[PDB]
Design a binder for this molecule. Structure first.
Ligand SMILES: CCCCCCCCCCOc1cncc(CC(P(=O)(O)O)P(=O)(O)O)c1
Ligand SMILES: CCCCCCCCCCOc1cncc(CC(P(=O)(O)O)P(=O)(O)O)c1
Ligand SMILES: [Mg+2]
Ligand SMILES: [Mg+2]
Ligand SMILES: [Mg+2]
Ligand SMILES: [Mg+2]
Ligand SMILES: [Mg+2]
Ligand SMILES: [Mg+2]
Lengths: 358, 358
């Protein structure tokens, strides 16, 4: 619980210790270690760690208490999720052309790193996960299923980003394998602006790895049978939380202090299907849909200001407040159908600190 | 090459079929399918497939013959290696700023793709491997070890590229987390120009995934005990072949026909530690080391020509011929110490078609 934040060095060093036994000259081993120590420290730390904590809490309250050897396996899984998060955020910042993350410059922007290194380093963080899982859970019975869950959550997240990045592109309105020169100028597509499509995306890009994966890890580790019907109930609660979480992420993109959120809002300029876009479209007048189509997705201050002002005009802040209230209720209703008092507590607890933390 | 080249569609479609069962609207499922079918087709096909073939041949000759159900598991592992190769090459081309690969434009250059998609797609190809391995070998006893081998070969390759890309950088002569502005202009470092360091790199970036991984897969699948002392003999032969193979790759970078190799030589402009660089440095005069340092790593045709002409002047073509002859001998000497006539045949056979194919 507090156990968690202090176990970081243990797992970081376990992994770095694997690197250190490679057949490399000694000057090179030292340099590798400096680099990969910074990679982990810079990218895994400084987060709210809600996904990691969720593995730890699910583990405790699924059981009747847990020795400090069993805790070591729990916290390992917990840091793996936080490393997965690190890997994804490094990648997302390359794809979304990010500036700031957790209040510092994005990894890929550092001049001793650059994109060439950033990409390589994503795949390293990602694989570190499974090396760590092998070190601490090779001999557990859930081993194969735990690595199977990380794998299948990751795949859903990958398709998730794929749609996040491409739902408005010419591709989706045959792929031209001879064009390496003429870039499409980003333009929204009206057919795609609807909650149905938005849910598909947000569920795949967020719900599985942020909520399903950590919940299922804890349970798997605590001995709960994979075949059990509680998993399909957990999957549906995970879908609702992810929707709830991502829409909040989208709200912060427009209305959050970039010093408080740690990052800079870019959804409009990057042509993203976001909840405020969809809500404004279902509420606004025809003259304003034209105004939306001719200003969205353009990396141009005056165009962005048009869209932000429409969001002020159509009182989107008030509409969010209203959504947050209704969804929180749909979610609590789903939690109370689990009939498991421990998980129910953890999920209610999570639902409260989802935006604060700690 | 018979069974193998025709089983592609089977494994491609298995995986695409997994994607198609995701909870997505039907118009999106169709678009996903077009895209991911092209991703596989465009990037897995058109290679010499030497690593795939090596899994198949090791599998046959380790045994006394194999039903078409057991062949299905073999060819699966074989295509997984070729998919791994595909994933790596898509990545390498982003990192090395590639133009052409297997005689077509690099994936990341296509305008419907771009880097943002290329990166996402690498992680998808990579994860497709383990999904496929689960489909066809979940119930085999070597399952856990086979996925353990892919994982540990990939890690070595990642550190391999890391050194390939960074051996000459200021990092390696402390990383500044506040510099996003002053990009270092690439310049060689004299201390690093030596075979010792070169071996470290080429072994990690090539030897493990191109030779050790496919050999060890076949053996694992054929029931050979993981603990056996034949594996450490196989590892050392793998190091010698990888050195042999990569040096040839480096030679082709300057002296190969870009229509025959399918790619454009870029080692000099990208500031790479290559075998010809090291050999020229061992042989050349001080006025030419200055000439090397001034012109290497600059993305400029006239600078590259200066270095190419030094490579002509110092008769590097003849020096390669000489290396190829001695190493081929060191390799055959190692093969003959295996005391296993089947593997010995496959490895001798591989050694011959390593540059032609088929
Ligand atoms: C092999 C290298 C390829 C690996 C790439 C795997 C793709 C997974 C990364 C994307 O997954 C994400 C899911 N939800 C959230 C984010 C954060 C951002 P947003 O969702 O773009 O709004 P933000 O925090 O800036 O608002 C990222
Ligand atoms: C997270 C996304 C990145 C995932 C990390 C995977 C990086 C591993 C790439 C290793 O790639 C290669 C290994 N050996 C050989 C080559 C031949 C190339 P080069 O000579 O090394 O440029 P070529 O001459 O064929 O162009 C490539
Ligand atoms: Mg994004
Ligand atoms: Mg983003
Ligand atoms: Mg956002
Ligand atoms: Mg390279
Ligand atoms: Mg290259
Ligand atoms: Mg090369």
């Amino acid at each position: 619980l507090a156990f968690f934040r202090n176990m970081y060095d243990k797992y970081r060093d376990a992994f770095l210790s694997h690197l250190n036994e490679y057949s490399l000259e000694e000057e090179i081993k030292e340099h590798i270690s400096k680099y990969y120590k910074l990679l982990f420290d810079y990218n895994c730390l400084g987060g709210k760690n809600n996904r990691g904590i969720l593995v730890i809490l699910i583990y405790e309250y699924v059981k009747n208490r847990i020795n400090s050897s069993e805790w070591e396996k729990a916290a390992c899984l917990a840091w793996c999720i936080e490393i997965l998060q690190a890997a994804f955020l490094v990648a997302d910042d390359i794809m979304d052309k990010g500036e700031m993350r957790r209040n510092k410059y994005c990894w890929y922007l550092l001049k001793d790193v650059e994109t060439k290194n950033a990409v390589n380093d994503v795949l390293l963080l990602y694989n570190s996960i499974y090396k760590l899982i092998e070190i601490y859970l090779r001999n557990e019975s859930c081993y194969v299923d735990v690595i199977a869950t990380f794998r299948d959550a990751t795949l859903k997240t990958i398709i998730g980003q794929h749609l996040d990045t491409n739902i408005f592109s010419d591709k989706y309105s045959e792929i031209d394998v001879n064009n390496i020169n003429v870039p499409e100028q980003p333009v929204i597509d009206i057919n795609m602006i609807n909650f149905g499509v938005y849910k598909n995306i947000v569920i795949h890009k967020t719900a599985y790895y942020s909520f399903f994966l950590p919940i299922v890890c804890g349970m798997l580790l605590a001995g709960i049978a994979v075949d059990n019907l509680i998993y399909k109930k957990i999957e549906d609660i995970s879908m609702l939380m992810g929707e709830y979480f991502q829409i909040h992420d989208d709200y912060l993109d427009i209305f959050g202090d970039s010093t408080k959120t740690g990052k800079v809002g870019s959804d409009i300029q990057n042509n993203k299907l976001t909840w405020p876009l969809i809500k404004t479209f279902e509420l606004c007048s025809e003259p304003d849909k034209i105004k939306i189509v001719k200003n969205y997705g353009k990396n141009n201050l005056a165009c962005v200001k048009v869209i932000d002002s429409l969001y002020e005009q159509y009182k989107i802040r008030k509409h969010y407040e209203s959504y947050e209230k209704a969804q929180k209720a749909k979610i609590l209703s789903a939690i109370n159908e689990l009939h498991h008092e421990g998980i129910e507590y953890v999920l209610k607890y999570l639902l409260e600190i989802l935006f604060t933390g700690v």
